[PDB]
Amino acid sequence: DRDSCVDKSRCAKYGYYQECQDCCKNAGHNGGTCMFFKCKCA
């Protein structure tokens, strides 16, 4: 799942966000980036 770090990932139009970032390290994606109003990861 990790909905909280994919769709419900509390981000902006574009940017970065340490929450989804650090979550995504743990997930093993790599890290996160904001766009187009959510945080997505690798």
From Swiss-Prot:
Disulfide linkage: 5-23, 11-34, 20-39, 24-41
Superkingdom of the source species: Eukaryota
Main location class: secreted
Localization per Swiss-Prot or TrEMBL: Secreted
Site (Key residue on the interacting surface with the channel): 35
One GO MF term attached to the UniProt entry: toxin activity
Chain's role: Blocks human and rat Kv11.1/KCNH2/ERG1 and Kv11.3/KCNH7/ERG3, as well as rat (but not human) Kv11.2/KCNH6/ERG2 by binding to channel outer vestibule (S5P domain) with a 1:1 stoichiometry. Inhibition data are the following: hERG1 (reversible, IC(50)~7 nM), rERG1 (reversible, Kd=6.8 nM), rERG2 (irreversible, Kd=2.8 nM), hERG3 (irreversible, Kd=4.05 nM) and rERG3 (reversible, Kd=38.1 nM) potassium channels. The toxin potency is not affected by elevating potassium ion concentration from 2 to 98 mM. This toxin only blocks channels in a closed state.
Protein name: Potassium channel toxin gamma-KTx 1.1
Species name: Centruroides noxius (Mexican scorpion)
Included range, full protein: 21 to 62 of 62
